[PDB]
């Protein structure tokens, strides 16, 4: 099969910004109860508020509380 | 919508200390969401794009790196762009990041494109940082507005009938491109099926066919799957994102697939470069990298046990 794509043999490199990229990890501070409440919150949000096309309702991702 | 003012304020922090926030109003951000959502719905869910284009992988709220990437590649509309998703979560400035990308989609709707990553859905970005960032700076209702916008993002793109682009990867349920075109928006991302896989799957050199994915979601796929897919659809390359790679790009299956990752020094925990792939009008593909001078894989945290 004929292939059209080709790749350059030379990559351009420059220096990334030098700064502190560390970020908070809120998902490490979830108790079992917090997770249950988030599952419930998401379920209620997707059941009552989040608009979804009629032909895509089967794709909405619900959680087991 | 005061679009030009918004863009100028977003870009103004370029000369500033990293991490300076941009003070957009709630109503400005809502407008970015609503106007971009309309444009996403007016364009196909499977984009058909033409080179020249620069293609970028994950950003994850690393706003100062996004600014650097545009400085390096050319600020819109000097170059056309396609981003492969994962704009939010797991970085410090998801809001500025997504607001600039939505602003450029509205300003340059035929020259600037955004695909959906697995973090552009409610269940994932509820927990990996975006909801909390919205709540701190604005309110939960604004996060719900973002969700409505994300639920309308396109899912894949084909560049010049030859490069198939998506966030995650292939699916055992992908037999025809019409199956992508038939997906109706707004939609959530399901926990399994074609739309899940396009946003979640990974290549694996040791899998023959389809395998389990240790994210707890979707599949892995082998090199032979890639080769058969390209041959069936007369494509030359799969271009995807979704995994940190040391040089910002990494080939798979004798260069039949490439992974792009555009957030250097990801989360301050990895020593990777961020890359973009520039495709010229002759379909010559080149890489521009910004190099610093599984822990990183999002999985099934909220639902496992
Ligand atoms: Mn990612
Ligand atoms: Mn991802």
Residue numbers in the entry:
A (entry chain C): 516 to 580
B (entry chain A): 7 to 299, 326 to 337
Quote the passages of the study that discuss this structure, keeping the authors' original sentences:
In IRSp53, the dephosphorylated residue S455 is flanked by three other potential phosphoacceptors, S453, S454, and T456. We considered the possibility that strong interactions with the Phactr1/PP1 hydrophobic pocket might also allow efficient dephosphorylation of these residues. That this might be the case was suggested by our structural analysis of a phosphomimetic fusion construct, in which the S455 is substituted by glutamate, at 1.39 Å resolution (Phactr1/PP1-IRSp53(S455E)). Strikingly, in this complex, the phospomimetic glutamate (S455E) does not replace phosphate at the catalytic site. Instead, IRSp53 T456 occupies the position corresponding to S455 in the wildtype complex, with a recruited phosphate positioned as in the wild-type complex, and the glutamate (S455E) in effect occupies position −1, pointing away from the catalytic site. Nevertheless, the critical contacts between IRSp53(S455E) L459/L460 and the Phactr1/PP1 hydrophobic pocket are maintained, extending the intervening sequence G457-N458-L459. Consistent with this, both wildtype IRSp53 pT456 and IRSp53 E455/pT456 were effective substrates for Phactr1/PP1, exhibiting three- to fivefold higher KM, but only twofold lower catalytic efficiency, while IRSp53 pS453 and pS454 were very poor substrates, exhibiting 10–30 fold lower catalytic efficiency. Thus, Phactr1/PP1 substrates can tolerate either three or four residues between the target residue and the hydrophobic residue that engages the Phactr1/PP1 hydrophobic pocket (see Discussion). For example, IRSp53 pT456, with only four residues to the pocket-bound L460, has comparable kinetic properties to the bona fide IRSp53 pS455.
The three Protein Phosphatase 1 (PP1) isoforms regulate diverse cellular processes, acting in partnership with over 200 different PP1-interacting proteins (PIPs). The four Phosphatase and actin regulator (Phactr) proteins are novel PIPs that are implicated in cytoskeletal regulation in animal models and cell culture settings. Here, we show that Phactr1 confers sequence-specificity on the Phactr1/PP1 holoenzyme. We show that efficient catalysis requires interactions between conserved hydrophobic residues in the substrate and a novel Phactr1-PP1 composite surface, which comprises a hydrophobic pocket and associated amphipathic cavity with a surrounding basic rim.
